[PDB]
Enzyme design. Structure first.
Site, short mmCIF file in Angstrom:
data_model
loop_
_atom_site.label_atom_id
_atom_site.label_comp_id
_atom_site.label_asym_id
_atom_site.label_seq_id
_atom_site.Cartn_x
_atom_site.Cartn_y
_atom_site.Cartn_z
N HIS A 1 56.32 63.45 53.01
CA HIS A 1 56.50 62.31 52.09
C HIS A 1 57.08 62.72 50.75
O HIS A 1 57.48 61.85 50.03
CB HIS A 1 55.18 61.64 51.81
N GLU B 1 34.68 55.10 38.66
CA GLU B 1 33.51 55.40 39.49
C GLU B 1 33.95 55.69 40.94
O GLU B 1 33.45 56.60 41.57
CB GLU B 1 32.45 54.28 39.39
N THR B 2 34.89 54.92 41.43
CA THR B 2 35.41 55.00 42.77
C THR B 2 36.87 54.56 42.66
O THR B 2 37.21 53.73 41.80
CB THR B 2 34.60 54.04 43.66
N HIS C 1 56.24 69.05 68.60
CA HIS C 1 55.81 68.67 67.28
C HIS C 1 57.00 68.67 66.33
O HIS C 1 58.10 69.07 66.67
CB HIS C 1 54.79 69.66 66.79
N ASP D 1 57.07 65.71 58.86
CA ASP D 1 57.55 64.72 57.90
C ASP D 1 56.82 65.01 56.58
O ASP D 1 55.61 65.02 56.55
CB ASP D 1 57.23 63.33 58.43
N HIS E 1 34.24 59.03 45.83
CA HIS E 1 33.30 58.88 44.76
C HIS E 1 32.51 60.16 44.62
O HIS E 1 32.04 60.72 45.62
CB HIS E 1 32.39 57.73 45.14
N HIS F 1 52.86 65.17 57.48
CA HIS F 1 52.26 65.02 58.79
C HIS F 1 53.28 65.14 59.88
O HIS F 1 54.45 64.90 59.66
CB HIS F 1 51.51 63.69 58.91
N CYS F 2 52.81 65.52 61.05
CA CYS F 2 53.64 65.51 62.23
C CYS F 2 53.96 64.05 62.60
O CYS F 2 53.16 63.18 62.35
CB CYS F 2 52.92 66.26 63.34
N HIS G 1 49.40 62.21 67.23
CA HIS G 1 49.44 63.52 66.53
C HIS G 1 48.70 63.51 65.19
O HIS G 1 47.93 64.43 64.89
CB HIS G 1 50.89 63.99 66.35
N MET H 1 46.95 66.45 62.57
CA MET H 1 48.20 67.08 62.24
C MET H 1 48.77 66.50 60.96
O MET H 1 49.80 65.85 60.94
CB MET H 1 49.15 67.00 63.43
N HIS I 1 33.12 56.02 49.72
CA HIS I 1 32.06 55.06 49.37
C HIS I 1 32.08 53.77 50.21
O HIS I 1 31.52 52.76 49.80
CB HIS I 1 32.05 54.73 47.86
CU LIG Z 1 52.45 67.22 66.38
CU LIG Z 2 54.20 59.20 56.83
CU LIG Z 3 27.18 55.01 45.12
#
Ligand SMILES: [Cu+2]
Ligand SMILES: [Cu+2]
Ligand SMILES: [Cu+2]
Ligand SMILES: O=N[O-]
Ligand SMILES: O=N[O-]
Ligand SMILES: O=N[O-]
Ligand SMILES: O=N[O-]
Ligand SMILES: O=N[O-]
Ligand SMILES: O=N[O-]
Ligand SMILES: O=N[O-]
Ligand SMILES: O=N[O-]
Ligand SMILES: O=N[O-]
Ligand SMILES: O=N[O-]
Ligand SMILES: O=N[O-]
Ligand SMILES: O=N[O-]
Ligand SMILES: O=N[O-]
Ligand SMILES: O=N[O-]
Ligand SMILES: O=N[O-]
Ligand SMILES: [Cu+2]
Ligand SMILES: [Cu+2]
Ligand SMILES: [Cu+2]
Lengths: 332, 332, 332
Positions: A93, A272-273, A88, A91, A248, A128-129, A138, A143, A299
């Site tokens: 971001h 709303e969303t 493993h 990373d 939502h 994330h891995c 992964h 992960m 939603h």
């Molecule tokens: Cu991993």
């Molecule tokens: Cu990424």
């Molecule tokens: Cu709805």
């Protein structure tokens, strides 16, 4: 000179809860130290008893939310114990360079590593891995998590006035692609390694079998519902490491939403969303105005109600008939 | 009166490179003349030798980026030579009227046509072929590109200060839907026309078989990686004529992003990942701060790493340990 | 005190048309009264004669657009006549509390109910049926619409100057998941209840069989095309209760777009295509500058042209050669 900076060790907590932090920074820049242990484990993901070999940071899907301030340093000790079977890495971001730390954090079973990076940009970000040649497997095995880098003076509205939250929850949404036999039944494997070629075929359909919050169908319901009170200001951080989602709050709104999760931008109002693209974390601020049960969903309602992407809030307090009322209850 | 305006002939270049232009306009409005030749050709799209009958503007997938300024006129001579078999045309999302020029540019094999339009709105925009009754088939066979209409005074940040890029690349992402036999093997045809009813069935699954940058799996890798240097300001234009994408620079960010690609709007800042809706071009501005290899992907990581939507940057220069460093390298 | 407020009864109209209203409010707050009758009916959705058991508000897919102003009260009398077979209810994303009114509006066949809520947030919002345990099935059977809550002083541009529309249309886009037999033929049922387990299986594919505007393939074409004139300012409200869409006016633009539909935010300018997330309504303002036929599509062009998500505008008036012209018509 990093050696003169204060160090603080933070103990992480299980999602949907978030470790203690200060919104507005009460110190200068710090090196904030975290430890995470990789755990590969069997997980039951639905009511029917479907089992996967999940790959987790710190035993949970998602991995825990980390919380720092802009221009802190994050120092992560990452442990892969020798009870695991796979290589493993991690990373972020949030980080700049070396594939988000991915190139520098490759740990076989029985190894550990310590990575440091400066948190130069404020926002919620996915981590994330991402091991060479096995990245989607992964990530879609669980992960991933998120990190929040708060501005040093906390959050602001679209006019630049303070926004202070009373509670914060972290919802990690996870797309799973469990392999099926000819007839449609989910397959089982003794080890993660066994599943690999079947996993790739399932992924390539681009059609997940389950979409869940916090690791399982119904994980944020019942005894495990999110709670609040009328009058409270709640921040919900939501991440999806691989696929688009559209959160939502049923019966509410997103008062202030950073849909792509970056706090230097003004928030969108009265949503709303909102769309959180795969590979992103978002954040929504809401003030509860009515008591009762709320459902928080993706939603795409098929994803929500058939595939698992639904959770509950239970909110206590006083009903406000001015906002909503039944004039004539259902009757003949 | 158009006849008094200067004319300039521009020779187009193959993506990911972009023809020479000025960011800030050094002339008044011009008629900018382009020529494109339609080429229908066989293309190998993956490592396994899968072959499609692609439909291209100027021999490439995507078609080349065209670059003008706001309130220039674009004059496009469009040639369909008689070695082609199909009727084609062109729709510019930059243009106003006649289905983006689509109604006016229908060319059988052996015909040509010249279209002029005024570039009234600044931004990056898709162009694509759209013949009556065969629109998705042409577009998803590779018949799309983009045009950039710069503001006359170049790009601006969210405060209105100049943003000047040092390099610019154009990444066209392409969803392909290659037909399969009963067992899952890709089919082959001698002509484009043969594939038609099989193409429609494949499209209707809404599930692409390949998603690629610049026409092929691995096209922007190796010798063909995008290059830059630490300190350089890079603009990446990204288009998807048919399906949503979510770009991400692994190890970096989108400092300034116009996700839907229209420069009268302020950019979003500090993006980790942004959503470019199908039928749109977007643009992201980044300043490199660390050397090394970066992957630029669609962050549906199945799309990226299984289906082909990944490319590389190779960045030269000086490592900055303040931003990121390995404190303790992987070990027991 | 609500009893002292004026009451106004509004009669709803069939989409794509919208009931008469004032953009800028000419009264104080009112209680605006609407009535809707639930109709379950057979609908033919495509050219081939495919029939579904649709679930409708007021006989149409989508249900009608309701139009109020910020801080009005909406009072909805909802009738489920005893010729229907299912339990229905209504959730307004505009409303605060009780699952958007869903918890309070459960009506068996032969029942009615009256719900009131205060419209506290300005924007276009989805409403949809959402009965316990059958939510996606009702919604994807056509049981959704939208409501527009205008600001009391009407719409504003990004600088805060008035934007006045001359015409308004409502486009409801609907994803259907019609069950198929082994070979791919659409199945038929005498009642809605018969289809249920087959409906769930079809939904779980996440792959719609049809995506339509206003209830059917080709519904907004021919005699039923949307009309305008060069010079007119047109507002198009577009909703999708369950799945993401990316509208585009072929030959035009979105001059001012609220993609997620909430009018306290400034609009995005000069859009070619914009993303409306599932569970959201959006609105786009355009001024026509050329006559002729325009296609308004979901710009996943497979969705548009193979699955049905395309409509037409017919625009009358004067051609402007300055904007676009054929210099040399198609020829040898
Ligand atoms: Cu991993
Ligand atoms: Cu990424
Ligand atoms: Cu709805
Ligand atoms: O139990 N480990 O997959
Ligand atoms: O796996 N710890 O050295
Ligand atoms: O990336 N899928 O929405
Ligand atoms: O497209 N992701 O729901
Ligand atoms: O980047 N979203 O605020
Ligand atoms: O070789 N033309 O498809
Ligand atoms: O195909 N040129 O006339
Ligand atoms: O249009 N598909 O993301
Ligand atoms: O949904 N397009 O990745
Ligand atoms: O239209 N996007 O900046
Ligand atoms: O005719 N009612 O489905
Ligand atoms: O169904 N009306 O009482
Ligand atoms: O929710 N599907 O785009
Ligand atoms: O992803 N909906 O087109
Ligand atoms: O919330 N969209 O303007
Ligand atoms: Cu063509
Ligand atoms: Cu188009
Ligand atoms: Cu219903």
């Amino acid at each position: 000179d990093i050696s003169t900076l204060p160090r603080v060790k933070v103990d992480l907590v299980k999602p949907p809860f978030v470790h203690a932090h200060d919104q507005v920074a009460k110190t200068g820049p710090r090196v904030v130290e975290f430890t995470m242990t990789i755990e590969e484990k069997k997980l039951v993901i639905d009511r029917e008893g479907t089992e996967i070999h999940a790959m987790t940071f710190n035993g949970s899907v998602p991995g825990p939310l980390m919380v720092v301030h802009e221009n802190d340093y994050v120092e992560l000790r990452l442990i892969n114990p020798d009870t695991n079977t796979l290589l493993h890495n991690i990373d972020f971001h949030a980080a700049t360079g070396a594939l988000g730390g991915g190139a520098l954090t490759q740990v076989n079973p029985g190894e550990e590593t310590t990575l440091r990076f400066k948190a130069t940009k404020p926002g919620v970000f996915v981590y994330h891995c991402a091991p060479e040649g096995m990245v989607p497997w992964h990530v879609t095995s669980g992960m991933n998590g998120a990190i929040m880098v708060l501005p040093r003076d906390g959050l602001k509205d679209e006019k630049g006035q303070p926004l202070t939250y009373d509670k914060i929850y972290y919802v990690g949404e996870q797309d799973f692609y469990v392999p099926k036999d000819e007839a449609g039944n989910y397959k089982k494997y003794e080890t993660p390694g066994e599943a690999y070629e079947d996993a790739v075929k399932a992924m390539r359909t681009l059609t997940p079998t389950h979409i869940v919050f916090n690791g399982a169908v119904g994980a944020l319901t019942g005894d495990h519902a999110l709670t609040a009170a009328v009058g409270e200001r709640v921040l919900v951080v939501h991440s999806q490491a691989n696929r688009d989602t559209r959160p939502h709050l049923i019966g509410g709104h997103g008062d202030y939403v950073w849909a792509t999760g970056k706090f230097r931008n003004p928030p969108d109002l009265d949503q709303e969303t909102w769309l959180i693209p795969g590979g992103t974390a978002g954040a929504a601020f809401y003030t509860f105005r009515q008591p009762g049960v709320y459902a928080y969903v993706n939603h795409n309602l098929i994803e929500a109600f058939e595939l698992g992407a639904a959770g509950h809030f239970k909110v206590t307090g006083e009903w406000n008939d001015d906002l909503m009322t039944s004039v004539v209850k259902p009757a003949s």
